[PDB]
Write a protein that binds this ligand. Structure first.
Ligand SMILES: COc1ccc(C2=NCCc3sccc32)cc1
Length: 282
């Protein structure tokens, strides 16, 4: 079926939970043996969210190459994403090592450091120009260059230096700051505006390594971001845009990381975002 009228048919019939449970039943199951080794326990935020072995990002280290991060490679859309958990106190150096090694231009953050009165990720970037951060375990230096605070999101320019080679690179930090502590946004308009700002920066384009995107577990809000982006790109590329099937795209993405889209409300919000986004494109 088309998307907008399939949408109204699920709303009128109140069957979002049943649709979402079908997706959970059909989703791929692949091994995640490296994630579950005992030496990696303090590298995982949640015991039930792990990268598959076949698609995990490897650190370029011979001691321990493990990080909780997955490469989502969308063949028809010609787009790639790295989805990862919010960094932990003992993995902030690994996180920036990955950004460096994978040649990423942009980092997309969809959570606040504290939500619901608890810490959802480490404070992993510097908040003042004159107070830079050094990650001694991976030999990287990170400096805040500029910050632009808007009503729904903040964009930061950062300098990452590899202290071993003295090479430097400019990284863009795109921070969506207004996702509610509970539920999903009422309108997709600010989320879509944010997605378009990431696109306009070049951070999603083939002349760079894959964008790094995260929330707390790296599957819920993060899944919504890449699902909406890929569906809109396919609607622009195909002769028949009404052939794009958001449930089929989500199942394709779940071949590369488990659990993408965590609730039926996140599934409905993803439909809403693609539907409204397709009107603005034209
Ligand atoms: C031994 O070094 C460690 C540092 C931090 C942690 C974590 N702190 C916050 C919550 C969670 S979940 C998984 C690891 C953590 C664990 C080990």
């Amino acid at each position: 079926m088309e998307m907008e009228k399939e949408f109204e048919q699920i709303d009128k019939s109140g069957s979002w939970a049943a649709i979402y449970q079908d997706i959970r039943h059909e989703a791929s199951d692949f091994p995640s043996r490296v994630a579950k080794l005992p030496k990696n326990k303090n590298r995982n935020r949640y015991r039930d969210v792990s990268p598959f072995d076949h698609s995990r990002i490897k650190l370029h280290q011979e001691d321990n190459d493990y990080i909780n991060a997955s490469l989502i490679k969308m063949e028809e859309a010609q787009r790639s994403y790295i989805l990862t958990q919010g960094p932990l106190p003992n993995t902030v150096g690994h996180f920036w090592e990955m950004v460096w090694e994978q040649k990423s231009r942009g980092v997309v953050m969809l959570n606040r450091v504290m939500e619901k009165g608890s810490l959802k990720c480490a404070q992993y970037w510097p908040q003042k120009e004159e107070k830079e951060m050094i990650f001694e375990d991976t030999n990287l230096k990170l400096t805040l260059i500029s910050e632009d605070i808007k009503s729904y999101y903040t964009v930061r320019q950062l300098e990452l230096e590899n202290l071993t080679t003295q090479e430097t690179r400019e990284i863009l930090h795109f921070h969506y700051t207004t996702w509610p502590d509970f539920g999903v946004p009422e309108s997709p308009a600010s989320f879509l505006n944010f997605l378009f700002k990431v696109r306009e920066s070049g951070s999603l384009s083939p002349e760079h390594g894959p964008v790094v995107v995260h929330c707390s577990a790296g599957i819920g809000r993060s899944g919504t971001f890449c699902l909406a982006d890929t569906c809109l790109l396919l609607m622009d590329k195909r002769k028949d845009p009404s052939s794009v099937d958001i449930k089929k795209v989500l199942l394709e993405m779940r071949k590369f990381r488990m659990g993408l889209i965590q609730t039926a409300d996140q599934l409905r919000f993803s439909y809403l975002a693609v539907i409204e986004g397709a009107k603005f494109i034209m």
